[PDB]
From Swiss-Prot:
Function in brief: Catalyzes the ATP- and NADPH-dependent reduction of carboxylic acids to the corresponding aldehydes. Catalyzes the reduction of a wide range of aliphatic fatty acids (C6-C18) into their corresponding aldehydes. Can also reduce benzoate to benzaldehyde. Has a preference for NADPH over NADH as the electron donor.
Organism for this UniProt entry: Mycobacterium marinum (strain ATCC BAA-535 / M)
Residues of the full protein shown: 732 to 1174 of 1174
Biotechnology and industry use: This enzyme can be applied to the microbial production of fatty alkanes and fatty alcohols that have numerous applications as fuels, fragrances, emollients, plasticizers, thickeners, and detergents. Thus, together with complementing enzymes, the broad substrate specificity and kinetic characteristics of Car opens the road for direct and tailored enzyme-catalyzed conversion of lipids into user-ready chemical commodities.
Protein name per Swiss-Prot or TrEMBL: Carboxylic acid reductase
Record family assignment: Belongs to the ATP-dependent AMP-binding enzyme family. Carboxylic acid reductase subfamily.
Binding site for NADP(+): 54-58, 81, 91, 121-122, 147-149, 186-187, 223, 227
Domains: entry comment: The N-terminal domain likely catalyzes substrate activation by formation of an initial acyl-AMP intermediate, the central region contains the phosphopantetheine attachment site, and the C-terminal domain catalyzes the reduction by NADPH of the intermediate thioester formed from the attack of the phosphopantetheine thiol at the carbonyl carbon of acyl-AMP. Large-scale domain motions occur between the adenylation and thiolation states. Phosphopantetheine binding alters the orientation of a key Asp, resulting in a productive orientation of the bound nicotinamide.
Miscellaneous comment in the UniProt entry for this protein: The conversion of fatty acid into aldehyde involves three key steps: adenylation of the bound fatty acid substrate to form an AMP-fatty acyl complex, formation of a thioester linkage between the fatty acyl moiety and the phosphopantetheine prosthetic group, and reduction of the thioester intermediate to the aldehyde.
Amino acid sequence: RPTFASVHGAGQVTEVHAGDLSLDKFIDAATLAEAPRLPAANTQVRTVLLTGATGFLGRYLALEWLERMDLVDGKLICLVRAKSDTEARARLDKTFDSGDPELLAHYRALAGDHLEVLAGDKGEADLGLDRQTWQRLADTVDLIVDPAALVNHVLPYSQLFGPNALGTAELLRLALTSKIKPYSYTSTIGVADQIPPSAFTEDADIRVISATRAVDDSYANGYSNSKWAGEVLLREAHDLCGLPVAVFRCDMILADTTWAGQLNVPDMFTRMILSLAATGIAPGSFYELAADGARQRAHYDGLPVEFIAEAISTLGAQSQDGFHTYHVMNPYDDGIGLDEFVDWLNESGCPIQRIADYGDWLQRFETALRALPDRQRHSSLLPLLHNYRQPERPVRGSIAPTDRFRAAVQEAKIGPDKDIPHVGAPIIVKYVSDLRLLGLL
């Protein structure tokens, strides 16, 4: 099998190059030679392969695809990690049994005729699948939707290579066999960590603007490198056979209001809301104060999960030809930041008082967190407090450009706003109600 050492280490690896991620290292010559000669899958999608359905964004994508497949009497095939197909199906079923009877009924009804779950692993040859089954997927899948990844901000690229880079290449083997398949991929806006902002855009070829990258100790260095590698491989595949590709660079994915009991508990944002609610204390401002000591206008760049899933699905690779990259970010200079979230929590009846001095708040906050019972404390912000030692510098809008994504969302009239949504009080309040349902508050 291809490995991080084999691909990038041909001393230790201190830098990686886009050029090293050539398809010949991952895919056999016969497949590569044949790919440009193959026919395309039917433009009308009737079979979808979705990875990461047990994930937070992934489960929302599974609902979108189950609904879409229900329209056309089609099939959704989900690749899930488990020791057997039966166990894999049980894991997915559990994902949707969260204390919301309506969600459970909706999933069950759709799943009965439109869902197939296969146990597998992206890092393994043939996705860990039986060869005949892999061939069936190659023959029948009309779209690959691939949000699965190991999302870990502290691990090195050497360890994230298998699930995130090699895993992309394995899916590409499928996309390049029998019939050419559109591929929708989620990346991270964090790939910009090593790219000059003046050069970073949606339209750019990632291989050109990020040809060489460092391997080091900076935050999320490994994770961002791993996601970049998947984008590079997709670019190589597109040059080879023209497969339609949609890359969605995401960041903060928030909970949403339709279904109860659905949160990404370990996520830093979830931990922050639980912590504020449980302790009842917030700082005068989460952000740097102005010269006159006033609270400054700020914006929290995050988007609710249902909107993101709908956008990835509607604007994805099956929707048009070519290679398209989108920045799934909240671009508004709307004044809705962490301080506003605290105010919304209070308006909802969750009493949170402000401690004016940031340092004073931080010490009181750590003490209060330490005093919480184990179940709350374990899911709190305490293990991540080092990230909050200083107040945040406020930003008006997003750090990333969103011109292509916003225009596409507006053109497709996605969601209630027919545009990228703002974050509102219901999103924040949903964290509290869900935390209560889950037993954390």
